[PDB]
Amino acid sequence: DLNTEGDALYSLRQSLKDANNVLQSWDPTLVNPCTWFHVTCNPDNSVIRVDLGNAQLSGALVPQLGQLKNLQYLELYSNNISGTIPNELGNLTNLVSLDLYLNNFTGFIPETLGQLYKLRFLRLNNNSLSGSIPKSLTNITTLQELALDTNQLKSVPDGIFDRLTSLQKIWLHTNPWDCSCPRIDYLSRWLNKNSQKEQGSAKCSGSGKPVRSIICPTS
Ligand SMILES: *[C@@H]1O[C@H](CO)[C@@H](O)[C@H](O)[C@H]1NC(C)=O
């Protein structure tokens, strides 16, 4: 009897590279993945988390990874993983902490990420992700720590941080932010009002000025 969490998780092993044989213990033929290393299950024998951090893993993620609904913590951080973040990660409803940081990830940040309403922690940082933030992120009210730092990020949608009332720490620094007015108006004002929330200094592109220091004129 196939597990379907194990099948979903094995689809990841097929597309990744170790080379440390980290995933050697992932056997889909077992009744459940709960006995796998780097995998933890609840008393109901479903996968609530995956810690692959620092496994020296290369390759790309897979859309089948969204098949784990009870997945709470996904730690993929500190690897060589490339490609784009799958939209199917928006199908993890019970996802609390999503850590993709310190990887090669390219492309846009998925808009379906705004479908995680239990997500309290999002770290996409130290990646190649290209500039914008999904407007749907405002739908995460439980967001506390958001780290986007060290990426290709450029702009931000107006009023996106307004519905995040639980936001504590945020990392926007080391990004090619567009400080031209009146695009940078919201972010500059938000980073100044919320400056206790920001960790590090977000610098404007080519000027080197902090985003918060920018004051946009009307007319
Ligand atoms: C989302 O997950 C549920 C259960 O985990 C599954 O039944 C459904 O097909 C998934 N949908 C997509 C689009 O992945």
Side-chain angles (χ1 to χ4, degrees):
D1 218 36
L2 196 56
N3 173 257
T4 69
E5 287 192 352
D7 174 28
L9 220 50
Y10 180 73
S11 296
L12 178 62
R13 183 187 176 185
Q14 290 283 66
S15 71
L16 291 187
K17 309 296 184 300
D18 48 329
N20 268 100
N21 278 329
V22 182
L23 303 182
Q24 172 68 25
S25 64
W26 287 16
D27 182 24
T29 71
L30 297 180
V31 50
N32 51 32
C34 296
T35 50
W36 298 357
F37 288 152
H38 321 283
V39 172
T40 313
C41 289
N42 56 4
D44 290 334
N45 294 120
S46 179
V47 169
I48 59 181
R49 81 186 287 140
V50 178
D51 311 84
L52 277 184
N54 270 315
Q56 297 185 21
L57 288 173
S58 300
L61 303 182
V62 290
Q64 290 81 35
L65 207 58
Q67 285 293 119
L68 325 155
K69 207 159 193 58
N70 296 330
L71 189 68
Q72 301 185 159
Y73 306 85
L74 180 62
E75 318 291 298
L76 299 184
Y77 65 90
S78 294
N79 294 274
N80 202 22
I81 302 180
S82 57
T84 60
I85 313 175
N87 289 326
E88 290 72 19
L89 268 60
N91 197 17
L92 319 175
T93 284
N94 299 321
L95 202 68
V96 177
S97 172
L98 169 61
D99 302 81
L100 298 184
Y101 62 88
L102 278 179
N103 290 273
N104 208 39
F105 286 112
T106 54
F108 295 161
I109 305 181
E111 298 183 8
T112 58
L113 249 57
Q115 300 182 17
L116 330 180
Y117 58 93
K118 293 182 180 179
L119 183 81
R120 306 172 60 177
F121 309 100
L122 176 58
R123 294 166 258 272
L124 298 190
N125 59 274
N126 281 82
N127 285 273
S128 292
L129 304 168
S130 59
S132 207
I133 307 187
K135 316 181 69 175
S136 56
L137 272 215
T138 194
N139 277 332
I140 316 178
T141 51
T142 58
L143 194 59
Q144 292 193 283
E145 305 186 18
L146 169 68
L148 297 185
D149 72 88
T150 316
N151 275 271
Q152 290 313 311
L153 294 187
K154 296 186 177 300
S155 63
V156 154
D158 294 343
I160 185 180
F161 300 138
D162 293 346
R163 292 194 72 256
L164 284 40
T165 54
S166 300
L167 191 64
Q168 294 289 343
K169 324 288 186 177
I170 181 177
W171 293 256
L172 296 181
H173 71 76
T174 323
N175 278 276
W177 298 110
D178 194 355
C179 286
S180 67
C181 296
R183 181 53 184 175
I184 203 60
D185 182 44
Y186 173 78
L187 188 56
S188 58
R189 279 188 295 102
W190 188 92
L191 284 177
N192 202 267
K193 296 179 293 186
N194 290 269
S195 62
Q196 70 277 341
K197 294 179 175 59
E198 185 191 2
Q199 313 298 321
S201 295
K203 270 74 158 57
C204 304
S205 174
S207 62
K209 297 184 59 182
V211 178
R212 47 179 293 206
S213 76
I214 303 300
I215 310 178
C216 288
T218 65
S219 291

